[PDB]
């Protein structure tokens, strides 16, 4: 909408909201649902004929980004299961991940329509290019973030580190006597806490 | 403090204790003063004068 | 067991100080798993004497007039209790 | 700065999403099946000790 | 009978020790409201609590009246697979465009300054405190480990420690075989010497 | 055979895994109220966590715990198995909250015997 | 078969354990939902209630309506006026019906 | 047959089958039987069902208990704060009163936790003995099956019946989200704002009937409370059509569109995006906006 | 450690206890004649070490609330046996305070105690001596019981088809939901009341009753469990790995003056 090729997730979401309600996509999804619905679900929906029913699609079909990602991953197929669903193998994290694209025909239809609305080519490579353009340019936006104020923990750490530069008492105290002399004086001058009398020195028994 | 086989010395300060600038302060309440006199319905007269001291004296 | 709480010896002639106290000991053997030793130097206390000694160190080392405290025997040493922080 | 790299941030060693290993259900398991799952099915550790048992018998 | 307990309220025993209250352990004998309600005295806190409580009552009443007396124009029934208790969450936790990336970066910076470094330092203290608890002859602290330990991955260890060790063992095996045969028999391939 | 099975859809790239700070792994044991719960992993919820044998855990009930081996948040919690005294006097038809109210009040205030 | 000898699934590892044809039956199912392996050749009988036993020490713990809903029979000879209700397998609720005749095993 | 090593119940292995195989005639019969369906994006469902105000997803009775306990605690605060004596200046007295208040609130927080635990225990009992709280035919379907293993209809019926067996003050139903109901009903937000202003005025009068310093402190508190209450009910209440028309910055309009999209995604998006398209000359965007206002909104 | 009990009655040279120990075990003439070798320093608090560790501390010793906590009775043990105790404790308390002063509505506090350690053997999780009766109410519960089972392998073991394990009929019905709401004239069906596992969020936190409704404050104590044989921690969303490595470096750099003057021999 801002003359940037709909390079915004909010714009893409509004575009998809428009798409799903158009007659052609509505007809395609009606066929898909009617051929793959529980009997109980049919009985339930038929009972709401008077009112309007809004059925949110499952996330893998109702999320434009997921639809485009699956469509653009389809070219990387490595096999096909016993139910026709393609199995793709790609490199996402640190290991080769295999993903089974369920309902790839519906995914491809929705992706082609999304790409048609955005004024881009309806080919899986175009979907990858668009998704990579969505997320590109983030460094400039990072650079303009103003830093937050230091936390109370940060302030305490800074204060303590500045303080210990001066030195702790164990390093800055001068007129401190040797502990051995103090203990000897204690024994030789103060009453023992057992015999209740002044002992000359340290006695084991 | 409270528990089974827990050290009874493992108890903090009371609820009416505060720490301001490192020093510890105890918070308490007040009490009523003055000379009070009553008479029981059987005839006995009771006279009390509380000064707030620890040591008390009772006389018949 | 009950002995004196830790004190501070101070030498008036040389102005030389140092903490001191009674530290019990016993023949070493197996310890106990379910027991953290209590305060055996300053019994029945929350161990504030370390804080009081830390706060009083600056005053003692700077120089203190020890005429207001009892002497130890007939020597030039005086005992300063650590029941409360020292400010002078 | 590609989409996958972003989607790959939660699948690197540092921030890998945890995943718990699953169980299964066996409708009926007698001792024989237990063997088939306990000793057989580990035929890199059970190979030669089992061979020694069989040779002795 | 001794001292029979009265009632069955919770007591800290071997089977149960309860959930510690770290806030009270840390903020012992120190108020919390100077941090949660900075600048307010007790009377101001109570007055504010009363005002906000009445306001919340009014808002709750308005909201309940609204939700309970509104006409239904549409019915929203999410799609789920059969046998599934709840529908999958439609919210994703991964940033998709660059603006979301900048938003999450600012949030991460704040959280790092104010929620993660505190966790790190608390955990470091906990580890050192466990060491201190087990120290002093009570447990086996200092018997192994430390910061000087040489930790190697599986590949590094097997490549640089295991294989050379087995190589040395094999060479020792062959050399000892030959030397022992010579020592006992006095020859290398002829059994006893001066006999055959 | 399991380690080379494929993911089902691209949801795992977007959703919040099972064991997040907002979607924890909630588990339920039986016992006495307030008693610590015994729970555990089978190992290897993470690449860097051990997997040779099951690893057990003792955790307070009804609290959010985090395993910092794997990074998983869990909610072990206790449900007490309070049931009618089985001596043949159990009720054969729907029962109401009054008698149950009395029994539950007595159990909370004083406790009840164990079926051992 | 070793597996079947040692009480396992047998040749087919996806197979069940119970073989009611030779006496290996399911006691739990029998106690809870009755012996549904005799369902083809047995039928419930449908039409003296149990209220007469409402005052006994152990049955007094039940409500009056509960005992009224239960209908009894001598348990020896077929009541000639009682209809027959087909026993439906895969139905866990027919063993608990109050419309079928029962016998006072107290 | 002479042995029997059975268990209480054999484990159950699911049978998967697959999606139904509906023929052309069946397909047409199904399609002719459906209502006027509007397929919704996952974003729409997310914003409808997002957690906004009820952060902890607490039921109704828990919120009621918390408010009741707050009332009881406030009714007892002056007695606990009365007559406190401590050696020190005014600040020390203030800190002593703060500590007394904290002790009072910590005391009241434990009673609330105990009551929450007791009600949770009652509900735990309800789950532990389901067959003793149900009628036929749901009793056997609760006896033989666990919650994940039930049919959807039987599951719903069983759960509703078990919930309704309890007294009204123990039933576990989520509390209303004030922000949610305000975001999806323009009149409700207006009513909430009117209530906030009425309470602010009444509190201002009450304050003005009080001595001077308390007046200033409490008036500052009232201003803060009104501001934050408004930001709580509707964070985007300042994005008015007047403000949109007054905004000629592309970045500012994008920020407004993001903030509205986070909140509710309503026709204010049409306004913001229309004004952005005009300032940038996006005819494709204008066509899409026409389609949206025809269908989406 | 050890509690000596009555020091007075055990200091006497000749005692019934010493003679019994001589007869049966624990004492002998080697102690009467050579106490300096077989008694020596003995076992007890080290006053000199406590003083050194106290005077090495920074002003953190003044600003810590330790002396009012229930663990204040262990001050000497931790001052002696935990070098740099007061600075670490001050950092711990300031971390808690800064979490408390956050802008988030829920303040999570990490809790670590004797129960925070996992083990592969069950007898290591009990207090010693072990209770008379253990695992009365059943054994452990594995978190893995809440993960999806290996459906493919499970079907394959039984010789079932399992072709369409990933293809399920869609379900869109009002009969499948018990949680119904009305949101601006829209009747939303979403979710089923499950029971005790739907109320984990509220039962885990405790509110601040004085906090207003528009600025809630909740306190949550997050328990932490670790193996202690892993050497690598993965906190998840609570602490990123890079931040944790930074904290490790800073902690090892600051707590070095307290550790450098001692040898481990
Ligand atoms: C560890 C031991 C593991 C192996 C044994 C498992 C149990 C065997 C079956 C059993 O006990 O049936 C109970 C049997 C009744 O079983 P059931 O369940 O009613 O029906 C039989 C099954 O359907 C099963 O019927 P089946 O159709 O599978 O037939 C049994 C099968 C398997 O039988 C054997 O393996 C018998 C082995 C003994 C030597 C003879 C065969 C070689 O027999 C054969 O294939 C050979 C039949 C005899 C051929 C003789 C000429 C050669 O009752 C008894 O035998 C009562 C006496 C106690 C028997 C032993 C109880 C277990 C204690 C350990 C026994 C160890 C010794 C070997 C068993 C025989 C005694 C020497
Ligand atoms: C070959 C020997 C295999 C092992 C011994 C047989 C065994 O365990 O049988 C278990 C089986 C029962 O084990 P089970 O209970 O696992 O089998 C039933 C399995 N479900 C629950 C699925 C139905 O026992 C028998 O079949 C009869 C007794 C045999 C054991 C006799 C004593 C042997 C003592 C020395 C060992
Ligand atoms: C693989 C796992 C470990 C294997 C064990 C290796 C360990 C080393 C230990 C032992 C080595 C292997 C153990 C197995 C032992 C093999 C020895 C053995 O049966 O002879 C067979 C016997 O001579 C053959 O006699 P046969 O009957 O043909 O003729 C006779 C007569 N004329 C007759 O009328 O027929
Ligand atoms: Zn794990």
UniProtKB/Swiss-Prot annotation, chain B:
It is found in: Mitochondrion inner membrane. Belongs to the peptidase M16 family. UQCRC2/QCR2 subfamily. Component of the ubiquinol-cytochrome c oxidoreductase (cytochrome b-c1 complex, complex III, CIII), a multisubunit enzyme composed of 3 respiratory subunits cytochrome b, cytochrome c1 and Rieske protein, 2 core protein subunits, and additional low-molecular weight protein subunits. The complex exists as an obligatory dimer and forms supercomplexes (SCs) in the inner mitochondrial membrane with cytochrome c oxidase (complex IV, CIV). Component of the ubiquinol-cytochrome c oxidoreductase, a multisubunit transmembrane complex that is part of the mitochondrial electron transport chain which drives oxidative phosphorylation. This is Ubiquinol-cytochrome-c reductase complex core protein 2, mitochondrial. It comes from Euglena gracilis. The chain holds residues 20 to 79 of 474 of the full protein.
